[PDB]
Amino acid sequence: NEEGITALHNAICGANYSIVDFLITAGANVNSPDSHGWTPLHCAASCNDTVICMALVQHGAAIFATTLSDGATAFEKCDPYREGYADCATYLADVEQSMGLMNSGAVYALWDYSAEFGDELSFREGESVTVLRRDGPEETDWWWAALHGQEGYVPRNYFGLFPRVKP
Amino acid sequence: WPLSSSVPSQKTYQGSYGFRLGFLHSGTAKSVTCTYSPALNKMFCQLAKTCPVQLWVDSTPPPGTRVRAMAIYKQSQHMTEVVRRCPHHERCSDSDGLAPPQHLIRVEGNLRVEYLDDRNTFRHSVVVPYEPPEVGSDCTTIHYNYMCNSSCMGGMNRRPILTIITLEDSSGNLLGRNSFEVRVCACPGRDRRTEEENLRK
Ligand SMILES: [Zn+2]
């Protein structure tokens, strides 16, 4: 609509779990941003809705995606004034840390990417990438990774813990 | 009813063919039909509704391969008890003409379905031929139906069950094995939602 709001976005804030699941399974873009840069994950977090967050994460949510307005991540949008804050924040915090560690360090590209530099790695949406070096202190925004034998740096915000739903 | 003298394995085993499972959700828009929870490894489904289970393999097993499904109680103390339909459901008029009235698990959409009451273990199971995925598909989908509610007195009576899926050759020898918990209920979406909330505690 005029506000960048999609069908998925509306179901989330209204806590209409049945519609959300249907849309996700149908291949609804779990990362579509509204006028303010809010993705479905950002809305779910602001409602502290852990169940929805999980469904989104498990279906290709960009954990490190940031909003246009305050440049915050979903984790940072959790509302400590509403119930369920602790549970949701904890889940998202654990989700962030599990990336490049769980599932044998494997993460899923959520977007096509053309390297800008030879020391960077190029990849297509949906491909599985192994994170070799996560916690490099000198670069909090990139990971050393491997795809089809090739090693290079990749942007953290281009990955999900799970892959997108293809239609 | 006689108790089994043994308990089938629920050990995950990908085998030489890299056999694993995948799941779908059947929910018709607002109506939450059958939903799977990755975090819980648990399927929530409605009685007699389509329950898609996906077979994923790394490479193709030989022709004549078969796929078997069997339910067991999840709790150690109930494991020897054969999972079967309650008196009410066993007697109700919901036959498809192929499945034994006592069997919990049916397969829909396959006229080569075969059912077994094991003479030795007493366990019920259902088996179909393995078919490779359709063109443009990455997996083989089997449509299961569960014919009794978790809450049925005289049946499961609120005791959790696991479904064990095995891949076998034409002779019955094991090729791969996987399993998942199952709750058959009236509102699978709500129950899944609720159980994940409680786990986070
Ligand atoms: Zn029953």
Numbering used by the authors:
A (entry chain B): 657 to 823
B (entry chain A): 91 to 291
Task: Please quote the paper that reports this structure.
The apparently 53-kDa tumor suppressor and TF p53 is the most frequently mutated protein in human cancer. As a master TF for stress responses, p53 regulates a complex array of genes that can determine diverse cellular outcomes such as growth arrest or death. The ASPP (apoptosis stimulating protein of p53) family of transcription cofactors represent well-recognized promoter-specific regulators of p53 (14, 29), and exemplars to explore further mechanisms of TF selectivity in general. The p53 DBD has an immunoglobulin (Ig)-like β-sandwich scaffold that presents the so-termed loop–sheet–helix (LSH) motif to fit snugly in the major groove of a DNA double helix and the L3 loop to contact the adjacent minor groove as well as the DNA backbone, and a p53 tetramer recognizes the full RE.
For crystallographic analysis we used a p53 construct that includes the PRD and DBD (residues 62 to 292) and a C-terminal iASPP construct (residues 625 to 828). X-ray diffraction data were collected from microcrystals using a synchrotron light source and processed to 4.25-Å resolution, allowing structure determination of the complex by molecular replacement. Our final model includes p53 residues 91 to 291 with a coordinated zinc2+ ion and iASPP residues 657 to 823; the crystallographic asymmetric unit contains 1 such complex. Here, iASPP almost exclusively uses a relatively flat surface of its ankyrin stack (composed of residues exposed on the second α-helix of each ankyrin repeat) to interact with the LSH motif of p53, prizing the L1 loop away from its contacts with the S2 β-strand and the H2 α-helix. iASPP F818, situated in the C-terminal loop (tail) that is trapped between the ankyrin repeats and the SH3 domain provides an auxiliary hydrophobic shield for the interface. Our structural and mutational data suggest that p53 H115 is a key residue mediating the p53–iASPP interaction. Overall, iASPP engages p53 on the edge of the DNA-binding site, and does not seem to clash directly with p53-bound DNA. However, the p53 L1 loop is displaced by iASPP such that K120 at its tip is no longer able to make contacts with the base at the second position of a quarter site. In contrast to the displaced L1 loop, the other p53 DNA-binding modules remain well suited to interact with DNA in the iASPP complex. However, the p53–iASPP structure is distinct from the published p53–ASPP2 complex. A recent crystal structure determination showed that the HPV oncoprotein E6, in complex with an E6-associated protein (E6AP) peptide, interacts with the N-terminal arm and the LSH motif of p53 DBD. This HPV E6-binding site substantially overlaps where iASPP binds in our p53–iASPP structure, and there is considerable steric hindrance between iASPP and E6AP-bound E6 when the complexes are superimposed, based on p53.
